[PDB]
Nucleic acid binder design. Structure first.
Lengths: 80, 79, 68, 162, 165, 85, 74, 82, 86, 378
RNA sequence: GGAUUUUUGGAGCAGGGAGCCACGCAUCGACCUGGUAUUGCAGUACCUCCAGGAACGGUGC
C-alpha cells in the first residue's frame, strides 16, 4: 500500500503513536513492518489520565495501533 | 527457540491441567486438560471448569471445545 | 506470511501489555508469524505463573526491560 | 555562545537515568536563556549546568518541562512569570549559584507544582531563618535541599512570619 | 567511573531516592545511570555512574559524609566496573594501590599530601618531603581508596602519579 | 459449496428461501428481525421481506420494513420454526 | 485419549444433545444437527438458558460461528 | 450468491442505512464496491442522539454497515438474476 | 468499474469520522486497500463539527499535522473543503 | 543589580533594532512604501510619500534597485518590532560593587562581544553573503506561512473554497469563475442578495471558514501593519455603526434579516425577545460575515489580481499551463537572495566492472586504471 | 478472497440521589504518621517489621 511505503520512509524519524487504548507513545521509529508492527526507542508515553513515563525500548502490534503522526519532512508520493 | 504451537503440543502430551485467559473477560477464566487442538488454536478440553475470580466459584463442564477466538493466554496449573 | 521482527528480543526480559488492562512480565522464548509468544518465568502483575503462551491477537504492546 | 536553535538542534538528546527525555545544554558558556521555542516542548527537563546564566527567565510556554538542573551558573535572580511558561515545573536544582537575599527566592511561590527544590551553595543559605522562610513562602515544596520538609518545620514557620 | 554509596536512609521510596541522587550528583558531571534496589541485601545503597572519571573523583571528595535525607552518606569507588561502562567502552595487577610519580611541587608538602592522602582510610604510605616536595609515593591500603585519592586529584594542573604497576 | 449451503448449518437459510418461510433473527444491535429470506450468502448477508423489527427500550417496540439488506456480521442467531404457519 | 482434535470431537457430538455458550453469556441447549468448516452450528429442539435458567424453548436454530465461546456435550 | 454484487446494482436509488454505531444515513447511492464500501449523495445523516446534518456527499466503510432499508418499489426478483 | 470514488476526493480537504467518534479533518492525499489514510495538515476535533454554532465553532481542537490513520478505525468521510493550491 | 545599567542596555538594544529596520527600509524603500500604501486605505489619516519616490523606489536622491524578499524582510522586521515592544515594556516596568569587580583578576580573555554580538544579532547567517536573514530570525521561513498558489501575497487560493462551495450547494452548476462572481458580493449586496439563505447551516459554516481564511491571509500578507489596531478598528465599527444600513424606502435593515419603518420601531425591536434570541445565537456568524466583508474590501487588489490569474490559466493550452505552473513553482522554491574499440578495451583490460571500497565505494572500468588509483590525490 | 495485523464485529449494557458541595460493592497499588530492623559493592515485577490514617489513584459491574 501507498501509505505503508510512506511509513517505512519515516523509519529513523521521531513519530507519535496512539494505540487502540489511547496511550500515546512518542519517540524514534526504528523499524516499521508491512502489517504496521512498530519498533521504537527512547519513548515518552502519555496515558489516558494525563501522566507521563519514559521507556528505552518498545514494540507495538500493528492491529492495536489506532494511528501514527509522522514528521512534515515527508509531505513534499505526490504522483498518486 | 520454542515455538508457541509446540508448547501446546507439549501441554497435550503432558496432560498438564491448563488454565486459559479469555478475551475481554477477566472475571471468568477456563480450565481443563488439552486432549487435542487445531490450526485455529481451537482446543478440546477435558474435565473443564469455569473459574470465577470474583466469586471464587467453579462451574463444572466436562467435555469442552473452546474456540480459539477467546484465547488471550495459556498457563499450566499443578492441580 | 511474514515473521514479526523479534529475534532482537529473544531471551530478554519483557513487560507485556495485554487487552483487558492486563499486564505480565517474562523472558521471550519464541514466536510465530501470528505474533503468538512463548514467555518463560512469567509473572502476572505479582504472582508467578511459569512458562506460558500468549496469543498475538491479544498483545497490545511490549516493552523490553533490558537493552537490545 | 548565545543559546540558539542551531545550538539546541545539535545538542545531545537522550533518555536519562530517571527515565525522562532530557536535553544536554551543559558547558556551552551560555549567558542568557533564550530561543527555547526550538526544543518544541519535547523534553521533560533541561540540563543547563556549568553555564553563565544570570537570571532564570526567558522561557517560552513549555508544558512538558518538569525538571530543570541549573548547577554551577551565576543565577542571582528569578523571573516573575515562571508559572505562566512552566506550569508543571516539579524539580528545580539551583546548587552553586548566586542567590543572596531571601526576597529573591520569592518568585518560586508562584510555581504550583514545585516539589523538589535545591538551593545549596548559594549565599542566601547562611541567612538567618533561610529554611523556615522557604517553607512558609514556598509551601508546595516537599523536599528542600535533599531533606524532607517536616510538619514541625511548617508549624515553626507559621509562628515566625504568621 | 562508578561510586558506591551506603548508609542511606532506606525509608525513601526507590524512585524518589534515584531522582534526588541524580539531582545531587549532576553538579559534578553527567550521571549516566543509577543502580539502587530495596532488597534486604541492597537496601541503603546505590551505585552512581558518571560519563567522566574526573567527575566521579570530585563527587567522592566533595560529598563525603553529606547529610542526605537525614543521614551522612558514605561514598567509595566501586569494586568492579559497571556493565554500562563496559558496553560504552567496547595487565594483571591493575587496579594497583601504590602510586609513585612526581610532577606535584609548588610548596607542596608531606602533611599536605598526608592530609589529602589521609582523606582516605587507605592512608598507608606517603613520601613527599625532600628539597623535592615534588616526588609523591603513596601506598593506599587498597586501590578503591588509592583510586579514590588518585581519581580525586587525577589532573592536578599535569602532575604524574604512576601506580606501582 | 452448494452442498455445504444445502446440508450444513446454513441449510436453515437455504430452507427458508426455498419454502418462503419466516425466520427470526436475533441480532447484535439487541434487536430482532422477523421475516422472510429472499437471499443469503456465506456471511449471512440477507435480503429480507415483510420484516417486523422488534426490540426493547422497560418498553417493547416494533416496526414494519417491507424491503431491506442485512450485513451478516450482525447475526447472532437465526431461528427457524413453526413461525410461518 | 490419543490425540482427540476439535474437528472429530464436534463430529462425534453430531446427533447428540449439546449446549453452546456464546461470548455474550447466552446459552443454547439442543441436538446438534450439523457443523461446518467455519464452525457455524445448527441445533434442533433448542432451549435457551440465560443466567443458567430456562428462558425460551426455540426449536431449530442457526448459530453464527463468531458468536461461539465454547461447546459442551450434555 | 455474492450479495454485494446485488448492492452494487443500486446506484441512483435512495436508501436508509443503519450503522453498527447506531447512526442513521439517508441518501442516494452513487456507488457500492466489492468491500461494501458505500458512497452517497444528497445525504441526511443522523448520528444517534443528534439532529440530522446534510451532506452533499458521504463515503462509508463497508464493515460499519448494519443494514440497508431498500425502496418498497424495489424489484428484487429482477436484481437477483445474474 | 471506475475505482474513482476515492481517487476523486484525493487532494481535497476531508472530514473523517473515527470509530470512537473523533473528527479528523485534513488534506486527503493517499489511501489503500484497507482504507489506511494519509492526511496532511490534519487537526482533531471532539466536541462538534461546526455548522456556525453562534457560541463558538471550535472546542477541543488539536493540531496534529501529517497523519496516517489505520482503516480498521475509520467509519466515514465527507468533503470538507476544496484542495489548498500549494 | 544597578537598574541604571539594565535600563541603559534596554535603551541601547531598542536603538539597535530601530537602526536595523531603518537600514532595511534604506536598502529597499519598497519595504516601507508597500506597507504604508496598504495602511493608507485602512487608516485614512495616514500621510504617504510623494508618488515619484514610490515609483522610482527612492527615499531622497538615490533610486534603489527593485527587489519573496520584500515579504521576508517584512516578517523579519515584524519579529524585530515584537522584540522592541517587549523591551519597551520591561523598561516601563558604587564602591561596594567596584570592589567585587576585582574578583577573578587573572583571566586571559578578550571581550569584544556586547555591542558587536547585538549589532550582529540584528543585521543583514551565511559565511559572508548567502542569506539576507539576520541571526535573530535565521529559522524564519515564508513557505510555512504562504502556499505556492498564494505566491507570497500575489494571489489568494480560492479553489479549495470553490470545492467546499460545491459541497454546500449540493450541485455542480457552479464554476470557479461563477464562485468568484459570488464572492464579489462581499456594503449591501452580500446582505440583500445572498448566494444562499443566510440562515442555512452549511452556508454559515462555509462563510465562517472562508472569513477566517481571508483575515489570516490579510494580516499574513501585510506583517508591518499593527494587527491589533486593525482588529479593534473593525470591532468598533461593528458595534457603533453596523442601523448602519438605511434605505429611504424600507428604512433600517438588521443583520433578524428584516427592515423597519422608522428608527423608533427599530430601537424598540432591539430589546424584543426575537432580536435577543437571534443576536444571541447568530452573533459569531454575523461578525464573521462582516469581517469577510471589510477584509475583502481591503484586499480588492488581490481579489482582482487572482480573478485575472484564473481567467488567464483558464485560457491557456496544455504546454502553456504547464510552463506557468513551472514558474509559480520556481518562484516558490527559490532563495530570497541570489548569489568503438571493442576488442581493444577487452584486450587492454578496460571497460570491465570493478570497485574500490575505500574510495566512495567507487567503480573502476579497468585494471590498469585501478592499479593507477593506488597513486592518486583522492 | 468470514479463522489472530484492517472489509463479515468482543460486542452489548449500566449513574442518579440528598442538602455550589458530598457519594454503592470487589480487586490491586503505591501512600501518609509514629516507632522499629538492617551497614549490606549492585544492573531491579515489589521489597524491614509493628501500630494507626486514607474527604488517595486505576479497573469492572
Amino acid at each position: 500500500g501507498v501509505p505503508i511505503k510512506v511509513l517505512h520512509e519515516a523509519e529513523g524519524h521521531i513519530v507519535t503513536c496512539e494505540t487502540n487504548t489511547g496511550e500515546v507513545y512518542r519517540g524514534k521509529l526504528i523499524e516499521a513492518e508491512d502489517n504496521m508492527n512498530c519498533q521504537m526507542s527512547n519513548i515518552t508515553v502519555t496515558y489516558r489520565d494525563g501522566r507521563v513515563a519514559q521507556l528505552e525500548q518498545v514494540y507495538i502490534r500493528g492491529s492495536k495501533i489506532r494511528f501514527l503522526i509522522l514528521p512534515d519532512m515527508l509531505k513534499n508520493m505526490l504522483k498518486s | 527457540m520454542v515455538q508457541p504451537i509446540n508448547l501446546i503440543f507439549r501441554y497435550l502430551q503432558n496432560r498438564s491441567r491448563i488454565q486459559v485467559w479469555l478475551y475481554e473477560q477477566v472475571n471468568m477464566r477456563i480450565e481443563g486438560c488439552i486432549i487435542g487442538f487445531d490450526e485455529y488454536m481451537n482446543l478440546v478440553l477435558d474435565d473443564a471448569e469455569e473459574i470465577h475470580s470474583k466469586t471464587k466459584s467453579r462451574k463444572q463442564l466436562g467435555r469442552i471445545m473452546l474456540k480459539g477466538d477467546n484465547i488471550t493466554l495459556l498457563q499450566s496449573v499443578s492441580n | 506470511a511474514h515473521p514479526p521482527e523479534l529475534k532482537k528480543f529473544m531471551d530478554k526480559k519483557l513487560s507485556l501489555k495485554l487487552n483487558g488492562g492486563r499486564h505480565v512480565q517474562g523472558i521471550l522464548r519464541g514466536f510465530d508469524p501470528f505474533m503468538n509468544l512463548v514467555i518463560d518465568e512469567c509473572v502476572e502483575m505479582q504472582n508467578n505463573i511459569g512458562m506460558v503462551v500468549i496469543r498475538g491477537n491479544s498483545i497490545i504492546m511490549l516493552e523490553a526491560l533490558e537493552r537490545v | 555562545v548565545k543559546l540558539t536553535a542551531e545550538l539546541i538542534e545539535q545538542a545531545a538528546q537522550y533518555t536519562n537515568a530517571v527515565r525522562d527525555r532530557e536535553l544536554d545544554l551543559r558547558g556551552y558558556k551560555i549567558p542568557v536563556i533564550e530561543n527555547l521555542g526550538a526544543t518544541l516542548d519535547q523534553f521533560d527537563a533541561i540540563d543547563f549546568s556549568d553555564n553563565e546564566i544570570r537570571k532564570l527567565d526567558g522561557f517560552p510556554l513549555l508544558r512538558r518541562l518538569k525538571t530543570l538542573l541549573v548547577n554551577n551558573n551565576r543565577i542571582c535572580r528569578i523571573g516573575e512569570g515562571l508559572d505562566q511558561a512552566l506550569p508543571c515545573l516539579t524539580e528545580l536544582i539551583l546548587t552553586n549559584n548566586s542567590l543572596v537575599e531571601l526576597g529573591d527566592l520569592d518568585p518560586l511561590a508562584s510555581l504550583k507544582s514545585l516539589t523538589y527544590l535545591s538551593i545549596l551553595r548559594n549565599p542566601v543559605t547562611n541567612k538567618k531563618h533561610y529554611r523556615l522562610y522557604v517553607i512558609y513562602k514556598v509551601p508546595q515544596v516537599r523536599v528542600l535541599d535533599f531533606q524532607k520538609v517536616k510538619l514541625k518545620e511548617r508549624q515553626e514557620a507559621e509562628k515566625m512570619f504568621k | 567511573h562508578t561510586i558506591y554509596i551506603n548508609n542511606m536512609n532506606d525509608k525513601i521510596k526507590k524512585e524518589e531516592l534515584k531522582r534526588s541522587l541524580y539531582a545531587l550528583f549532576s553538579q559534578f558531571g553527567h550521571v549516566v545511570d543509577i543502580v539502587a534496589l530495596k532488597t534486604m541485601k541492597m537496601r541503603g545503597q546505590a551505585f552512581v555512574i558518571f560519563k567522566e572519571l574526573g567527575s566521579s573523583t570530585n563527587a567522592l571528595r566533595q560529598l563525603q559524609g553529606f547529610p542526605f535525607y537525614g543521614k551522612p552518606m558514605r561514598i567509595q569507588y566501586a569494586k568492579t566496573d559497571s556493565d554500562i561502562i563496559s558496553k560504552m567502552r567496547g595487565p594483571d595487577y591493575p587496579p594497583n594501590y601504590i602510586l609513585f610519580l612526581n610532577n606535584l611541587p609548588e610548596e607542596t608538602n608531606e602533611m599536605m599530601l598526608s592530609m589529602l592522602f589521609n582523606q582516605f582510610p587507605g592512608f598507608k604510605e606517603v613520601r613527599l618531603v625532600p628539597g623535592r616536595h615534588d616526588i609523591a609515593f603513596v601506598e593506599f591500603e587498597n586501590d578503591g581508596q588509592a583510586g579514590a585519592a588518585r581519581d580525586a586529584l587525577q589532573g592536578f594542573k599535569a602532575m604524574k602519579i604512576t601506580y606501582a604497576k | 459449496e452448494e452442498e455445504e449451503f444445502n446440508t450444513g448449518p446454513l441449510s436453515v437459510l437455504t430452507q427458508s428461501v426455498k419454502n418462503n418461510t419466516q425466520v427470526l433473527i436475533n441480532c447484535r444491535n439487541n434487536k430482532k428481525l422477523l421475516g422472510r429470506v429472499k437471499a443469503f450468502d456465506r456471511h449471512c448477508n440477507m435480503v429480507l421481506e415483510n420484516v417486523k423489527e422488534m426490540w426493547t427500550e422497560p418498553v417493547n417496540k416494533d416496526r414494519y420494513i417491507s424491503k431491506m439488506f442485512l450485513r451478516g456480521d450482525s447475526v447472532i442467531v437465526v431461528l427457524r420454526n413453526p413461525l410461518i404457519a | 485419549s490419543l490425540p482427540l482434535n476439535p474437528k472429530p470431537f464436534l463430529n462425534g457430538l453430531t446427533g447428540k444433545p449439546v449446549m453452546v455458550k456464546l461470548k455474550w453469556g447466552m446459552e443454547y441447549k439442543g441436538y446438534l444437527v450439523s457443523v461446518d468448516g467455519y464452525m457455524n452450528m445448527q441445533l434442533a429442539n433448542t432451549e435457551e438458558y440465560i443466567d443458567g435458567a430456562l428462558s425460551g424453548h426455540l426449536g431449530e436454530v442457526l448459530i453464527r460461528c463468531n458468536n461461539v465461546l465454547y461447546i459442551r456435550g450434555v | 450468491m455474492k450479495l454485494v454484487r446485488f448492492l452494487m446494482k443500486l446506484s441512483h436509488e435512495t436508501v436508509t442505512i443503519e450503522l453498527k454505531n447506531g447512526t442513521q444515513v439517508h441518501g442516494t447511492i452513487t456507488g457500492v464496491d466489492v468491500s461494501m464500501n458505500t458512497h452517497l449523495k444528497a445525504v441526511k445523516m443522523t448520528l444517534k442522539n443528534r439532529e440530522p446534518v446534510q451532506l452533499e456527499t458521504l463515503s462509508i466503510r463497508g464493515n460499519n454497515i448494519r443494514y440497508f432499508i431498500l425502496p418498497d418499489s424495489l424489484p428484487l426478483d429482477t436484481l437477483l438474476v445474474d | 468499474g471506475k475505482s474513482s470514488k476515492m481517487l476523486q476526493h484525493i487532494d481535497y480537504r476531508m472530514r473523517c469520522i473515527l470509530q470512537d467518534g473523533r473528527i479528523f479533518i485534513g488534506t486527503f492525499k493517499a489511501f489503500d486497500k484497507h482504507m489506511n489514510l494519509i492526511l496532511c495538515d490534519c487537526d482533531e476535533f471532539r466536541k462538534i463539527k461546526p455548522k456556525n454554532s453562534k457560541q463558538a465553532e471550535r472546542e477541543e481542537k488539536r493540531v496534529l499535522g501529517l497523519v496516517l490513520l489505520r482503516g480498521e478505525n475509520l467509519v466515514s468521510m465527507t468533503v470538507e473543503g476544496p484542495p489548498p493550491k500549494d | 543589580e544597578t537598574i541604571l545599567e539594565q535600563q541603559r542596555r534596554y535603551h541601547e538594544e531598542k536603538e539597535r533594532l530601530m537602526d536595523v529596520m531603518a537600514k532595511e527600509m534604506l536598502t529597499k524603500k519598497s519595504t516601507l512604501r508597500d506597507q504604508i500604501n496598504s495602511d493608507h486605505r485602512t487608516r485614512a489619516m495616514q500621510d504617504r510619500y510623494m508618488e515619484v519616490s514610490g515609483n522610482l523606489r527612492d527615499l531622497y536622491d538615490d533610486k534603489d534597485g527593485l527587489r519573496a524578499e520584500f515579504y521576508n524582510r517584512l516578517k523579519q522586521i515584524k519579529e524585530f518590532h515584537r522584540k522592541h515592544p517587549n523591551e519597551i515594556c520591561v523598561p516601563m516596568s558604587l564602591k561596594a560593587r567596584e570592589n567585587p569587580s576585582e574578583e577573578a583578576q587573572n583571566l586571559v580573555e578578550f571581550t569584544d562581544e556586547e555591542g558587536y554580538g547585538r549589532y550582529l544579532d540584528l543585521h543583514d547567517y551565511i559565511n559572508l553573503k548567502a542569506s539576507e536573514k539576520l541571526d535573530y530570525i535565521t529559522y524564519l521561513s515564508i513557505f510555512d506561512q504562504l502556499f505556492d498558489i498564494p505566491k507570497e501575497r500575489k494571489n489568494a487560493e480560492y479553489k479549495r473554497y470553490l470545492e467546499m462551495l460545491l459541497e454546500y450547494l449540493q450541485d455542480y452548476t457552479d464554476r470557479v469563475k461563477p464562485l468568484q462572481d459570488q464572492n464579489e458580493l462581499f456594503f449591501e449586496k452580500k446582505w440583500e442578495n445572498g448566494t444562499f439563505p443566510g440562515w442555512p447551516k452549511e452556508t454559515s459554516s462555509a462563510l465562517t471558514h472562508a472569513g477566517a481564511h481571508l483575515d489570516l491571509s490579510a494580516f499574513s500578507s501585510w506583517e508591518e501593519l499593527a494587527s491589533l489596531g486593525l482588529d479593534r478598528l473593525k470591532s468598533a465599527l461593528l458595534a457603533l455603526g453596523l442601523g448602519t444600513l438605511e434605505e429611504r424606502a424600507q428604512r433600517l435593515f438588521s443583520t433578524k434579516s428584516l427592515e423597519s419603518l422608522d428608527t423608533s420601531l427599530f430601537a424598540k425591536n432591539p430589546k424584543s425577545k426575537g432580536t435577543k434570541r437571534d443576536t444571541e445565537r447568530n452573533k459569531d456568524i454575523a461578525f464573521l460575515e462582516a469581517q469577510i466583508y471589510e477584509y475583502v474590501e481591503i484586499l480588492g487588489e488581490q481579489r482582482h489580481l487572482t480573478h485575472e490569474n484564473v481567467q488567464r490559466k483558464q485560457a491557456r493550452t496544455g504546454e502553456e499551463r504547464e510552463e506557468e505552473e513551472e514558474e509559480q513553482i520556481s518562484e516558490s522554491e527559490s532563495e530570497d537572495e541570489e548569489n568503438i574499440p571493442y576488442w581493444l578495451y577487452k584486450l587492454h583490460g578496460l571497460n570491465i566492472n570493478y570497485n574500490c571500497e575505500i574510495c566512495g565505494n567507487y567503480t573502476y572500468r579497468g585494471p590498469k586504471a585501478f592499479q593507477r588509483h593506488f597513486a592518486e590525490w583522492r
